[PDB]
CSV table of N, CA, C and O in Angstrom, one decimal:
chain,number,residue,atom,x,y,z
V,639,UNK,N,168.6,78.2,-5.3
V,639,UNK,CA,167.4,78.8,-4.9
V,639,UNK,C,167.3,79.1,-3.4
V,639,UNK,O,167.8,78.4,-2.6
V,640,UNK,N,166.2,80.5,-3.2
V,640,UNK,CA,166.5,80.9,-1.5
V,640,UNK,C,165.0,81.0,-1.9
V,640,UNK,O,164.4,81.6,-2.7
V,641,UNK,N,164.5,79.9,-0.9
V,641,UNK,CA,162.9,80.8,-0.6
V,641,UNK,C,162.7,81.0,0.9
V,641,UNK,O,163.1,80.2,1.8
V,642,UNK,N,162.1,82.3,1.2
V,642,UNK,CA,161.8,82.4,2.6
V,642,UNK,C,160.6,82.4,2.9
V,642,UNK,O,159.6,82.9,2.3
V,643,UNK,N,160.7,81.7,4.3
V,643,UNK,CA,159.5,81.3,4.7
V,643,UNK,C,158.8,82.3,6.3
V,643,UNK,O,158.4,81.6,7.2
V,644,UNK,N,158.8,83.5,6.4
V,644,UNK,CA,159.2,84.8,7.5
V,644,UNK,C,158.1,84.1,8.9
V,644,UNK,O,157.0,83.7,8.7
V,645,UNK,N,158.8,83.9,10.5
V,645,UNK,CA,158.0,84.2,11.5
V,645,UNK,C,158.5,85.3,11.2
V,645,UNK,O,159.7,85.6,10.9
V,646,UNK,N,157.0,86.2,11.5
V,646,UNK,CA,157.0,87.5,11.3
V,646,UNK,C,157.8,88.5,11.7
V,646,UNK,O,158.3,89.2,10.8
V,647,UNK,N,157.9,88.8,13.3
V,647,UNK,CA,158.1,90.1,13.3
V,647,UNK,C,159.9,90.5,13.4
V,647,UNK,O,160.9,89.8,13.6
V,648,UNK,N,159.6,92.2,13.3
V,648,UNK,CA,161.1,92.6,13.0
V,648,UNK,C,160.6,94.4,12.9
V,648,UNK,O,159.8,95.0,13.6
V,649,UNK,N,161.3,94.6,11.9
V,649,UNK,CA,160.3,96.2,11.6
V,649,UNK,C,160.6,96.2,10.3
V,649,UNK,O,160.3,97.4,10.2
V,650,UNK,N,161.0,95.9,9.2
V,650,UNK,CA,160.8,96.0,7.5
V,650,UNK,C,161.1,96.7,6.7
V,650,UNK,O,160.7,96.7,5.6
V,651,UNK,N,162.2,97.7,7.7
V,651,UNK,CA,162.4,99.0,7.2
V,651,UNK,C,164.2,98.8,7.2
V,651,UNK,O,164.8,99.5,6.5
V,652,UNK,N,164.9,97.6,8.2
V,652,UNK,CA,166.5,97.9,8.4
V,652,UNK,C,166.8,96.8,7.5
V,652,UNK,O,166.1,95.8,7.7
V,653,UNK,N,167.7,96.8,6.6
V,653,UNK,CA,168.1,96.0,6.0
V,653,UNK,C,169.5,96.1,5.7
V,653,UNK,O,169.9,97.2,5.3
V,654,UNK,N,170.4,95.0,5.8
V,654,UNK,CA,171.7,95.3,5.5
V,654,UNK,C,172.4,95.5,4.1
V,654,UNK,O,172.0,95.0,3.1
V,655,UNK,N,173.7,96.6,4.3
V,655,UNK,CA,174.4,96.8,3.2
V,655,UNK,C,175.3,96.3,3.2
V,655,UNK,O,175.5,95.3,4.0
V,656,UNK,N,176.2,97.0,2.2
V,656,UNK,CA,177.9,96.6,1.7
V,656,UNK,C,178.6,96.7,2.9
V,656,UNK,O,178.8,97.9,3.4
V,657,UNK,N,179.1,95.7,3.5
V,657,UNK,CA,180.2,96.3,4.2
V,657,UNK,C,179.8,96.1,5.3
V,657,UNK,O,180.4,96.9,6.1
V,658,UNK,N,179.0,95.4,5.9
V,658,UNK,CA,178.3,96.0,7.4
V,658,UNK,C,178.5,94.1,7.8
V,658,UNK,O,178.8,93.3,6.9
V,659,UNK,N,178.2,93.6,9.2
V,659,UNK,CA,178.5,93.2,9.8
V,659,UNK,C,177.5,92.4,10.8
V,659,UNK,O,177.1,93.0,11.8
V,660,UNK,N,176.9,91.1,10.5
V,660,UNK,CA,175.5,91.0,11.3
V,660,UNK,C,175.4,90.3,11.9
V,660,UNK,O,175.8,89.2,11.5
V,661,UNK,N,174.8,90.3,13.2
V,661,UNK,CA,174.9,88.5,14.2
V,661,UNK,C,173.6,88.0,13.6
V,661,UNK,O,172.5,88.4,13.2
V,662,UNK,N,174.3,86.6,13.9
V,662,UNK,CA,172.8,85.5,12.9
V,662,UNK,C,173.0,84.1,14.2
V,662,UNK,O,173.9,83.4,14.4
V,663,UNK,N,171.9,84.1,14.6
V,663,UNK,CA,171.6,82.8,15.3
V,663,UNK,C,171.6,81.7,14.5
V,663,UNK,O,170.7,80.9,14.9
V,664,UNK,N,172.4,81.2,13.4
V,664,UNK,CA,171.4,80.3,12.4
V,664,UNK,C,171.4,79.1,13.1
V,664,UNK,O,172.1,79.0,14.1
V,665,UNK,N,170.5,77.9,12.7
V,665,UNK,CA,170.2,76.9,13.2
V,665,UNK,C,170.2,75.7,12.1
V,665,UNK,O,169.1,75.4,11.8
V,666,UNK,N,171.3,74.8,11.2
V,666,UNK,CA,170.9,74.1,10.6
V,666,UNK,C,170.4,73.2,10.4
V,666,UNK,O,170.3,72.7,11.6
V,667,UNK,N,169.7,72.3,9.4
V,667,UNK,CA,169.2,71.0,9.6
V,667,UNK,C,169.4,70.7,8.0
V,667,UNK,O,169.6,71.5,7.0
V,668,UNK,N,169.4,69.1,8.1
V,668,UNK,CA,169.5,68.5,6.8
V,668,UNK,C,168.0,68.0,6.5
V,668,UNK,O,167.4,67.5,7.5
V,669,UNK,N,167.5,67.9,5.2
V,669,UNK,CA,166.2,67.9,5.0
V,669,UNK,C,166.3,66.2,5.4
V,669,UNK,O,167.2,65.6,5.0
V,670,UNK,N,165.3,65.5,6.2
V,670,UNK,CA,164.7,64.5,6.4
V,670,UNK,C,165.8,63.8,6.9
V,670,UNK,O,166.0,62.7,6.4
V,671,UNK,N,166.5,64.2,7.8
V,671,UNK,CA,167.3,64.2,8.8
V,671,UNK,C,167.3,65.0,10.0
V,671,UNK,O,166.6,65.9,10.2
V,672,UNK,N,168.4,64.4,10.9
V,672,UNK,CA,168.5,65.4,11.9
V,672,UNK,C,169.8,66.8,11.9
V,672,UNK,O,170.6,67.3,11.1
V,673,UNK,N,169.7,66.9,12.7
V,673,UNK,CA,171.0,68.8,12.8
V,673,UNK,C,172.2,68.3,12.2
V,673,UNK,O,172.6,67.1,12.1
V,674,UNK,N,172.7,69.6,11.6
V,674,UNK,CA,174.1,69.4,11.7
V,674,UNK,C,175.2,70.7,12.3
V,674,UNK,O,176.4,70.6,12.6
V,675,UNK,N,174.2,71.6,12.3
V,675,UNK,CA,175.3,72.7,12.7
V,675,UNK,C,174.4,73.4,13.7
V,675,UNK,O,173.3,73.4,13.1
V,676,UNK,N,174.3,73.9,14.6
V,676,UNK,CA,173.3,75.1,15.8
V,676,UNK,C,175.2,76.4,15.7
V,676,UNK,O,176.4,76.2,15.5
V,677,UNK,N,173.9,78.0,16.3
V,677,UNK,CA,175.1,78.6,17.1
V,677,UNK,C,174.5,78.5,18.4
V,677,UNK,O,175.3,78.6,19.3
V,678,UNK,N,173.0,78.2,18.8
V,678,UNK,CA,172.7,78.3,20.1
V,678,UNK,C,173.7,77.3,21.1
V,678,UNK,O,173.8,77.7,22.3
V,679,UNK,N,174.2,76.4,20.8
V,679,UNK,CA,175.2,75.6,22.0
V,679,UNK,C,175.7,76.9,22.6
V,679,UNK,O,175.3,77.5,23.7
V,680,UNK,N,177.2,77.4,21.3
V,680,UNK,CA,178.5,78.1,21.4
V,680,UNK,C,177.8,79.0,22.2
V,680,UNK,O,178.2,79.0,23.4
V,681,UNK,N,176.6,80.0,21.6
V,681,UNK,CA,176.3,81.2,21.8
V,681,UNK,C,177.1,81.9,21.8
V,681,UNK,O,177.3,82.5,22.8
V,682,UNK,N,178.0,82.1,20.4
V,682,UNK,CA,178.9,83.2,19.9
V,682,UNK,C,178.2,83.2,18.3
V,682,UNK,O,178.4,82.4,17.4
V,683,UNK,N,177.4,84.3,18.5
V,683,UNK,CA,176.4,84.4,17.5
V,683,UNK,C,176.8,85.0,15.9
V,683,UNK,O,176.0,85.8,15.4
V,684,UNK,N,178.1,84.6,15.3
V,684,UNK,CA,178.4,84.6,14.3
V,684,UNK,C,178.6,85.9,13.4
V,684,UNK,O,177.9,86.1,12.4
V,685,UNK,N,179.2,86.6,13.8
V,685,UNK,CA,179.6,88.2,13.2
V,685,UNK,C,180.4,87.9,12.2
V,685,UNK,O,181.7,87.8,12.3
V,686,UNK,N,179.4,87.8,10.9
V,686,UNK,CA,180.1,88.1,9.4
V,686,UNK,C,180.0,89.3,8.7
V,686,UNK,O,179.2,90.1,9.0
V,687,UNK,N,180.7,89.4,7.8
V,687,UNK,CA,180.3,90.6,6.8
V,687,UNK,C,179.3,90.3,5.8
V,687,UNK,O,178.7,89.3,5.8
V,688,UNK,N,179.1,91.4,4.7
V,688,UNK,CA,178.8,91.1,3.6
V,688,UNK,C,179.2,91.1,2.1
V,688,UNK,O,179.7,92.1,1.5
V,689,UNK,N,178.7,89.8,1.3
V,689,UNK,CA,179.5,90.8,0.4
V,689,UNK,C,181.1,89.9,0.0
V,689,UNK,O,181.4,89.7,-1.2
V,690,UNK,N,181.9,89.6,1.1
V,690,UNK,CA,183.1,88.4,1.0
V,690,UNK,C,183.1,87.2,0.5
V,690,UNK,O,184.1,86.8,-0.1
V,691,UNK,N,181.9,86.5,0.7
V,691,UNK,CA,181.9,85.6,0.1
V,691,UNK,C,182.4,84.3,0.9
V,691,UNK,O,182.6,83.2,0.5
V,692,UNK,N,182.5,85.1,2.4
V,692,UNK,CA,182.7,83.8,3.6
V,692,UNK,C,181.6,82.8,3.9
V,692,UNK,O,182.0,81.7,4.2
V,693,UNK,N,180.2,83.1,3.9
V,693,UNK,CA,179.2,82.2,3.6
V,693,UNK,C,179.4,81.6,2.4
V,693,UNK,O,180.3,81.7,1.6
V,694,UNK,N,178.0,80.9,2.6
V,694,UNK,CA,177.8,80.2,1.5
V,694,UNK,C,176.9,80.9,0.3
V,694,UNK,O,176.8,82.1,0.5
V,695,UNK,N,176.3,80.6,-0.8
V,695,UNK,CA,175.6,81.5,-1.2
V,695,UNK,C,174.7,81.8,-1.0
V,695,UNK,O,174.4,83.0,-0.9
V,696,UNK,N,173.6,80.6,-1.0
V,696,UNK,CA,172.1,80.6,0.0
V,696,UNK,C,172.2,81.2,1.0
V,696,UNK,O,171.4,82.0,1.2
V,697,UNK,N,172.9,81.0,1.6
V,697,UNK,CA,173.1,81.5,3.1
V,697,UNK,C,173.3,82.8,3.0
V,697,UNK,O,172.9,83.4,4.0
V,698,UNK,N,173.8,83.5,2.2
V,698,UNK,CA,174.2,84.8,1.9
V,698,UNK,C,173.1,85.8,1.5
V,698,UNK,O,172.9,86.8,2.2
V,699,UNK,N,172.4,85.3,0.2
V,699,UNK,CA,170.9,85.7,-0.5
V,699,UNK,C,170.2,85.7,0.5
V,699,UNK,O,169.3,86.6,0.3
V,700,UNK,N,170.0,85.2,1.3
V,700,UNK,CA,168.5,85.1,2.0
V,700,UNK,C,168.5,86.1,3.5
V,700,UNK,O,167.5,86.4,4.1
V,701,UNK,N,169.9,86.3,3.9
V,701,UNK,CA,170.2,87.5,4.8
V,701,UNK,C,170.2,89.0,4.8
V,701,UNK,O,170.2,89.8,5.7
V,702,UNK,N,170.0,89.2,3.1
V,702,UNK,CA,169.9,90.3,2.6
V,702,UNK,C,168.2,90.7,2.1
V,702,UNK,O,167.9,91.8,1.7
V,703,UNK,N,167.3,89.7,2.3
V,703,UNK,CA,166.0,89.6,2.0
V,703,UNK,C,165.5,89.9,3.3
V,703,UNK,O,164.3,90.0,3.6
V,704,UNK,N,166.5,90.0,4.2
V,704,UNK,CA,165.9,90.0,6.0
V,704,UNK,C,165.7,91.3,6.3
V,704,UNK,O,165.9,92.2,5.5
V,705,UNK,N,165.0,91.4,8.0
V,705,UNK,CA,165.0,92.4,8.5
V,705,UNK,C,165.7,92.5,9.8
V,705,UNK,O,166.1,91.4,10.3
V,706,UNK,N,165.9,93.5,10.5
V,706,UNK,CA,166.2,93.3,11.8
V,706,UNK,C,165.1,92.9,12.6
V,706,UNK,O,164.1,93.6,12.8
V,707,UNK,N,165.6,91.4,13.4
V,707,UNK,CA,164.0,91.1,14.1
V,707,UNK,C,163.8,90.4,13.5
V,707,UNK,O,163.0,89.8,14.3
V,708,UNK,N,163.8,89.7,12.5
V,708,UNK,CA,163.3,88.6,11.4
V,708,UNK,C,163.5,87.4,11.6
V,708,UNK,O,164.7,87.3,11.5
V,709,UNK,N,162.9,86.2,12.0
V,709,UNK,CA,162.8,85.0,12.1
V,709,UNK,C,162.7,84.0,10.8
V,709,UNK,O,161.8,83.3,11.1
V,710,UNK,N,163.1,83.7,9.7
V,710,UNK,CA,163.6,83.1,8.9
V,710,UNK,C,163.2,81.8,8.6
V,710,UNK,O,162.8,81.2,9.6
V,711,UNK,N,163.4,81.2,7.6
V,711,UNK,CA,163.5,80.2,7.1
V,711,UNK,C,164.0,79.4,5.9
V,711,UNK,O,163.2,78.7,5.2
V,712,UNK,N,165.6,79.7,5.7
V,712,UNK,CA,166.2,79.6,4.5
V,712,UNK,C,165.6,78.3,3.9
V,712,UNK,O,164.7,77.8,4.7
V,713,UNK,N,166.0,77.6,2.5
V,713,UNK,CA,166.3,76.6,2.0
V,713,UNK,C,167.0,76.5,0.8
V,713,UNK,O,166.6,76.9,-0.3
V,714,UNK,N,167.9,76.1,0.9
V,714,UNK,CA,169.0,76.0,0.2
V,714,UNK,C,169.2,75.0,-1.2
V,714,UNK,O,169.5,73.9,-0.9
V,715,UNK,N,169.1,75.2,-2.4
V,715,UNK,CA,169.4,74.2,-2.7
V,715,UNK,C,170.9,73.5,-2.8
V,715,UNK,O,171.8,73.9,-2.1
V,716,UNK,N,171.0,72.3,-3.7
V,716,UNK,CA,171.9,71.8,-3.5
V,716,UNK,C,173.0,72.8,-4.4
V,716,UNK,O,174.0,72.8,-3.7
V,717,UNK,N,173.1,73.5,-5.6
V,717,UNK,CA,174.0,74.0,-6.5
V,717,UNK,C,174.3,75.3,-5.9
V,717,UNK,O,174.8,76.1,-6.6
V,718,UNK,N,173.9,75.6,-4.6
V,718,UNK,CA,174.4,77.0,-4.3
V,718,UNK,C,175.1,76.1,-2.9
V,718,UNK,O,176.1,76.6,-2.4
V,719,UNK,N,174.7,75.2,-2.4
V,719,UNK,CA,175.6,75.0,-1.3
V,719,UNK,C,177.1,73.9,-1.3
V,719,UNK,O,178.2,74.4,-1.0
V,720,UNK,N,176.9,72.7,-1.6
V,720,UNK,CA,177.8,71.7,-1.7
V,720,UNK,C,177.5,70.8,-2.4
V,720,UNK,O,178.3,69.9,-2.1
V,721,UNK,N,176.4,70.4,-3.4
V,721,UNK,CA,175.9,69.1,-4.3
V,721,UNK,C,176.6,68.6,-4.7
V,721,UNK,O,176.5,67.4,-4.6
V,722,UNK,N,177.9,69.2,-5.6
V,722,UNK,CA,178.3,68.5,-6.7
V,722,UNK,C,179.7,67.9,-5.3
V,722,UNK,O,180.2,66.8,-5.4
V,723,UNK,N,180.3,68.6,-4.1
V,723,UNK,CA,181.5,68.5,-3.7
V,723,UNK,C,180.8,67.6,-2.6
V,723,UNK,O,180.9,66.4,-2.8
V,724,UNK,N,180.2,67.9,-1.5
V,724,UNK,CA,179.9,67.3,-0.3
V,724,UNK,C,181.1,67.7,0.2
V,724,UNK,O,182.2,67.7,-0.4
V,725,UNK,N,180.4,68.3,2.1
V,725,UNK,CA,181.9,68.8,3.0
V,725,UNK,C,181.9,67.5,3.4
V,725,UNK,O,180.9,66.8,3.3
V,726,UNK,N,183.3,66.7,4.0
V,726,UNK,CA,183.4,66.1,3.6
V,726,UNK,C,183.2,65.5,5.1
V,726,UNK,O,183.9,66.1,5.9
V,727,UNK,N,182.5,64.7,5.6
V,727,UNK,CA,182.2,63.5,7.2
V,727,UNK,C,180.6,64.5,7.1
V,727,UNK,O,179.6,63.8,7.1
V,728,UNK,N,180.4,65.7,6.9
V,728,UNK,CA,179.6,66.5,7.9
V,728,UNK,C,178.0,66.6,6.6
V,728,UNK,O,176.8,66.6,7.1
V,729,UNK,N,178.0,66.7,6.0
V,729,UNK,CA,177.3,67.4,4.8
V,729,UNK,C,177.4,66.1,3.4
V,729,UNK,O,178.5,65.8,3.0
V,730,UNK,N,176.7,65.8,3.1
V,730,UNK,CA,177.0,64.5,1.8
V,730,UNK,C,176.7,65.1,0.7
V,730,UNK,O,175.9,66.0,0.6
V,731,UNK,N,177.5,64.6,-0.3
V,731,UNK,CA,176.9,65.6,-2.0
V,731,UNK,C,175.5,65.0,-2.2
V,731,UNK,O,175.0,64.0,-1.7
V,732,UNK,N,175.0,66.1,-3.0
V,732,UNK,CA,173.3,66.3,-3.1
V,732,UNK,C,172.8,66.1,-2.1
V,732,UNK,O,172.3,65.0,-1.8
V,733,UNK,N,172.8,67.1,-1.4
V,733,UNK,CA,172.3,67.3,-0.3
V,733,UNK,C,171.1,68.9,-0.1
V,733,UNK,O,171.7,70.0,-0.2
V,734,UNK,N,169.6,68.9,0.3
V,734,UNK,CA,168.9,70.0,0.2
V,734,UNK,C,169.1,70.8,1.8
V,734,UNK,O,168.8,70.0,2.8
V,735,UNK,N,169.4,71.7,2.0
V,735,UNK,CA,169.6,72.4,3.6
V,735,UNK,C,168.5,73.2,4.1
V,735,UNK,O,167.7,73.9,3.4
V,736,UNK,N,168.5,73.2,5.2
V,736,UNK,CA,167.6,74.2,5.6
V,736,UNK,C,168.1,74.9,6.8
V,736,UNK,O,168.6,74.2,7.7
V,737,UNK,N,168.1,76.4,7.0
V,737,UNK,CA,167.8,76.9,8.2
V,737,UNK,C,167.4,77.9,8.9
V,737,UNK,O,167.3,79.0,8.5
V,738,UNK,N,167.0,77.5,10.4
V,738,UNK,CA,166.8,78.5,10.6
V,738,UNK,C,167.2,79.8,11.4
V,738,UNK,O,168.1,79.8,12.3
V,739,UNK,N,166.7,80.6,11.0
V,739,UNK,CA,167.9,81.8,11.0
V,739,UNK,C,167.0,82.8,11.6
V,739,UNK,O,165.8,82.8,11.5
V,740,UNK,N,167.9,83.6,12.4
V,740,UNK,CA,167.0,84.6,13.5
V,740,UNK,C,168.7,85.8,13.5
V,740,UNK,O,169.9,85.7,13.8
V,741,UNK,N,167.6,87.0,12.8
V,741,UNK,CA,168.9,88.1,12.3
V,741,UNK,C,168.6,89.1,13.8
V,741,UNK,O,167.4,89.4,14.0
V,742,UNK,N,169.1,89.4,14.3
V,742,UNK,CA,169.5,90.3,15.3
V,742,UNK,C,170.9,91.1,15.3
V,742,UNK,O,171.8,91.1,16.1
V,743,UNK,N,170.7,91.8,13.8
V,743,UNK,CA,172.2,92.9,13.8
V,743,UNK,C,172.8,93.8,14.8
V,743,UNK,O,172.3,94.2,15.9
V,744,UNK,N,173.8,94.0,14.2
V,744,UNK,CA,174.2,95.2,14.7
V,744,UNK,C,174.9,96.6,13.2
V,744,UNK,O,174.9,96.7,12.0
V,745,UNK,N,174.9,96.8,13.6
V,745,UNK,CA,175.8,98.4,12.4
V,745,UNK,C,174.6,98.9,11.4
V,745,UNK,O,174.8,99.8,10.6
């Protein structure tokens, strides 16, 4: 399950296709804990595609519900991210995710 939770603005009108290529600020957190993943440290703002299947799947669904400009608020359940496996030191099985995500594309 992806529900979004939108700071508003963006313009409502760009949304990404097949094939195209988007930078994503995301920001993770584990529910009723603290972080586990930021890009703001690196600030190499994550240029994936779409469509591959290099994300995750929450992570994937809820980028295509976006706009350009869009401030976000994924949550993830556990059966789209890692419940049954847990990554393994970083992420524990059954585990609920959240993050937040700020789409500023490009293409």
């Amino acid at each position: 399950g992806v529900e979004i939770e939108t700071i508003s603005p963006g313009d409502g009108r760009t949304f990404p296709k097949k094939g195209q290529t988007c930078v994503v600020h995301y920001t993770g957190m584990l529910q009723n804990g603290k972080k586990f993943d930021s890009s703001r440290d690196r600030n190499k703002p994550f240029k994936f595609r779409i469509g591959k299947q290099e994300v995750i799947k929450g992570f994937e669904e809820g980028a295509a519900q976006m706009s350009l400009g869009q401030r976000a608020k994924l949550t993830c359940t556990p059966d789209v991210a890692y419940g049954a496996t847990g990554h393994p030191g970083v992420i524990p099985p059954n585990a609920t995710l959240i993050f937040d995500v700020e789409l500023l594309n490009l293409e």
